[PDB]
Amino acid sequence: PKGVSVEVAPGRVKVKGPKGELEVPVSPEMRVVVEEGVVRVERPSDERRHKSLHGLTRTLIANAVKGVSEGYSKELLIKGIGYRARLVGRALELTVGFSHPVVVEPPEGITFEVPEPTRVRVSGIDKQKVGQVAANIRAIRKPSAYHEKGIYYAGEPVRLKPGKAGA
């Protein structure tokens, strides 16, 4: 956590980065402190719920920091045929297996950006709400449909028999 900007509040460790700030509030349980320069976190005890919280949370904020330290690596590879991804002005006008163009709009806190129509890119400045939108588009046009055709993160398609298996 070098050029970061953490901030200990009661149960809400606020953190600024080169892009913007993020508040990541978690249960006060355990201990949330900025010491020496890097941030630490430590369970109150060896209690199941607590241990869980300790790990989960410590890593949550650990990403929260590296989130404003730019954690955006998320982009969709649209495969298939007549599937073009455009970007006019602010909105993204991709055109999949659907009978109409797919119209998405970069909301507050994150940005998309479509280089070429075969693959959308998304600079996400919020690791949480990020994969949610990755999944937004992936689940907007689900791929693999038996043989192929659709929207892949990059996840190697599992097949199934094409012009067959239907008696």
Next chain:
Amino acid sequence: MKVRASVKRICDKCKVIRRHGRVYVICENPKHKQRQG
């Protein structure tokens, strides 16, 4: 399979994951897709 009182780990690549309260048996193939119901 898919929803039945006797849920197994069948092909070892399946797991028991006590999600949302009740038991499921998840894997890769959704054919093994049991559930404690």
Next chain:
Amino acid sequence: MKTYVPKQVEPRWVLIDAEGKTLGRLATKIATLLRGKHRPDWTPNVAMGDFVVVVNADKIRVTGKKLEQKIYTRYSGYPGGLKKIPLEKMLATHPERVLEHAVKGMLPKGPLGRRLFKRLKVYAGPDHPHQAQRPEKL
């Protein structure tokens, strides 16, 4: 001798917080006061137990999964007239109700048992009609 019966004493008013408190446990206390069980000369057939103005009942604490679990019910004489509402929605829309329901059931059923319910005003605030005395309690 012959047991003594109180004269027409002057009803004493009282104010209670609410927030952070436990629903049942709270009412638990309210009731015993709506009657004279706290006063040394409690009498069964009379009604002389303090009036109780409770503030911001909109923030009462409740254990377990009540919030999502606990379901209140009302039945209109009509077929399929059962109407059940979750403690969760009772707070949102007019929550001063929860505390009342909780208490009403914790008071006698007879005529005066409702008479004493009248002695209790609950507000989703705080804030009351600053009528008089009203010494806050704990």
Next chain:
Amino acid sequence: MKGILGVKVGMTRIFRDDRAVPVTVILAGPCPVVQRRTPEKDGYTAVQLGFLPQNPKRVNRPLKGHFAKAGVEPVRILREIRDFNPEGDTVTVEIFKPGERVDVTGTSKGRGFAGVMKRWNFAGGPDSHGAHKIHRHPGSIGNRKTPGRVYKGKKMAGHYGAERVTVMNLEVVDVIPEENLLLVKGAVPGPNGGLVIVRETKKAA
């Protein structure tokens, strides 16, 4: 969401367009706006609306000739449009332009105590084969021993008349300010020449 008061007249079928249209007419006419109602001293947003002028000795006392603008009362007194904050002056008819659809409230005429068939609707039956005893009759009501009671509101014979209804999605294709009329798709509840308010319709807002 605006409105206008009104009295009923006309019904025909005027060959507008080229096709036929059942034409219910209403005289909105000079229907006053006398007093608004604001949140804190009321709890909503409404206005009071009068109607036809003939009122001298038989009315008197408070009038609301008081109010803050007199004008005297109608004779058909006044009602109330919620969510409507006008401009000021007594509102005529043209509030609604031809080409819009609207809601409308009014009393239904009175058919009083009727026979269950002509009420909710049952059936009756045995006009011949069975008995003559139970022609226009409800037959049965509840179950045998349990419940052993008569269902709350299980449809029964009785009144079906002096009520009131609000109809939605009627269509006005004319409005004559020259004598204060409103020409709509005929569906007009109530009799020819009584109480009827018009308000804006609802579809998607």
Next chain:
RNA sequence: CCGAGCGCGGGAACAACCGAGACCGCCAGCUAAGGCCCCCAAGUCUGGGCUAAGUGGUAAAGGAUGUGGCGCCGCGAAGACA
């Protein structure tokens, strides 16, 4: 045991489950069963264990990386689980 004890207190309500043989009165005291946050009378007593389902608040063969504790047998600082 009732019946003959639908006389009494528990059992929410209940001849015969538990308590307990009513001559009569009393605005007196110990107590049974059962109980003690409030109905309704008495500990929101003391102290320490378990559970997260409203389990309590009425179900089995049977099923599981639920949680608490316990026992066994390798692996491992020669360096392991992943």
Next chain:
RNA sequence: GGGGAGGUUUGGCACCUCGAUGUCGGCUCGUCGCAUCCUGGGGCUGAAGAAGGUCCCAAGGGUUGGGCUGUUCGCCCAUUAA
């Protein structure tokens, strides 16, 4: 081959009712139940699509008209998203 549930069928019991508790179906009027016929949705598929097979959630509203039989049952006719 084992374990349960439901209380519609078919029974074992003989406690309310022999100084009366009118037994079949159809007309009329229903209301509720869900282990759902249809209509929403989703998971699986020995599912290309079409359509189907199966399970899980879901009663909002709907569940048609005739032939025959006193017959509820059922068979048939014309249909229906059913």
Next chain:
RNA sequence: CGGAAGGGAUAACCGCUGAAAGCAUCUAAGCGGGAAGCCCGCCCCAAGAUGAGGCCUCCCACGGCGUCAAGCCGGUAAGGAC
């Protein structure tokens, strides 16, 4: 003409960042989608909502016994009724 369109919370289920248990997870912290179904949005009742509410106004004292305490009695004002 009515079902609606739209809003809100969700099931089954589909998802995101994420641990305990260095990997994995749709979850134990948090967020999203998601049903003719739940709450509303609609129509009607409806303040005996004994709690009898709110608003716009409108009329008004001593007239005879209650001096001090609530009544009681006769015609009037807004009016109401026959």
